[PDB]
Design a protein around this ligand. Structure first.
Ligand SMILES: [Cl-]
Ligand SMILES: [Cl-]
Length: 395
């Protein structure tokens, strides 16, 4: 008539390893429940008795037993910060997204206390970071900015990067949307995207025939390329330039615009990074796009060329050798005042080179038009024409 169930509950909670073993051998119900539904596994998880947790599971304990609140052993181990028990429970099939009667999941309980190693393990095993409880609170809400956000962000970005390798374009697309959102965050977020390993996957996606994938991938890449020179170098080192140059032949004008914007951002870096753009063969396509009827594409190519021409004399000469000057001089007759200003800036950069570069500018007939625009009634164009003529005339 011994109450083996009661004795087992008490032995499990007290950490009496030998007594648990003996009670189980004598037929105690491993899934005994107390007055509010706690099983021996609940109590051992709460108290942190790893050996007893393992013995109970070996003897068939229900890893997902619910008490009357809906708490599982995983809830209790997460709440109490018992990391090794969390791992053992998950290894034995614990429900990582189980919710109690008010919608609380194990991740909520780990986050609220700052059990950040458990947070990491739960996320690694598929815990949902956006899970909301009865009052709309996510685990992030309950963490109160205790370091949870960095751990969750690391996990969210690495999962998004892995989805870029999926074999469904819709999975790739929705992941690119979220990565694009992160890249939109500017310098305070972009390094997290780089550190998640996104750049190689983004570059590889530039071979996709799916134009929506190309558009979202380029959007993310261009924003990363708007960072510092070390971030530009990561884009280059990921292999972006040959793929970007290929896309300058795209029939899609949005892809064309985004590719030029990304190339212009890269070309806004250091001299070696300008040289990478040249070495990838971008200049022929850039010069051809100066004839584009689309003014946004025209202006984006103009700006990229001006950035390239902000480099050394040999890089300026590469622009000249690609035939840019006749097209640039033509653009000084543009009715559009933005294109006129950007053409003056690019030509001024070219004119800031050496004697050889200055001579090509004069032979292209730029002096006639620079001195004419020196008196232009628009002050901005007047400035650029003045400064450009100065660069041409100095040294
Ligand atoms: Cl533990
Ligand atoms: Cl922890």
């Amino acid at each position: 008539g011994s109450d083996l169930g009661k004795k087992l509950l008490e032995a499990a909670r007290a950490g009496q390893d030998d007594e648990v073993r003996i009670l189980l051998a004598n037929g105690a119900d491993v899934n005994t429940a107390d007055e509010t539904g706690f099983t021996p596994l609940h109590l051992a998880a709460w108290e942190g008795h790893l050996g007893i947790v393992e013995v109970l599971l070996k003897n068939g304990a229900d890893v997902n037993a619910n008490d009357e609140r809906g708490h599982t052993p995983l809830h209790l181990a997460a709440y109490t910060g018992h990391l090794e028990i969390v791992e053992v429970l998950l290894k034995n099939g614990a429900g990582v997204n189980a919710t109690d009667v008010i919608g609380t999941a194990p991740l909520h309980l780990a986050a609220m206390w700052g059990h950040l190693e458990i947070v990491e393990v739960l996320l690694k095993n598929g815990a949902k970071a956006e899970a909301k409880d009865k009052f709309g609170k996510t685990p992030e809400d309950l963490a109160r900015d205790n370091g949870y956000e960095a751990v969750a962000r690391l996990a969210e970005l690495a999962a998004l990067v892995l989805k870029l390798n999926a074999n469904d374009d819709q999975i790739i697309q929705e992941a690119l949307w979220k990565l694009g959102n992160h890249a939109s965050g500017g310098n305070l977020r972009i390094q997290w995207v780089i550190d998640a390993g996104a750049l190689p996957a983004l570059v590889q996606l530039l071979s996709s025939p799916n134009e929506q994938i190309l558009q979202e991938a380029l959007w993310t890449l261009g924003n990363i390329a708007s960072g510092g020179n070390e971030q530009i170098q990561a884009v280059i080192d990921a292999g972006a330039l040959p793929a970007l140059v290929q896309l300058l032949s795209s029939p899609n004008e949005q892809i064309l615009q985004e590719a030029l914007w990304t190339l212009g951002n890269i070309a806004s870096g250091g001299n070696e990074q300008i040289q990478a753009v040249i070495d990838a063969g971008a200049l022929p396509a850039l010069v051809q796009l100066l004839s584009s009827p689309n003014e946004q594409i025209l202006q984006e190519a103009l700006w990229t060329l001006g950035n390239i021409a902000s480099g050394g004399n040999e890089q300026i000469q590469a622009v000249i050798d690609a035939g840019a000057l006749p097209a640039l001089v033509q653009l000084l007759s543009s009715p559009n005042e933005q294109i006129l200003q950007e053409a003056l800036w690019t030509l001024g950069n070219i004119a800031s080179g050496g004697n050889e570069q200055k001579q090509a500018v004069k032979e292209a007939g730029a002096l006639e038009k620079l001195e004419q625009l020196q008196s232009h009634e628009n002050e901005k164009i007047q400035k650029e024409a003045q400064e450009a003529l100065e660069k041409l005339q100095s040294h």
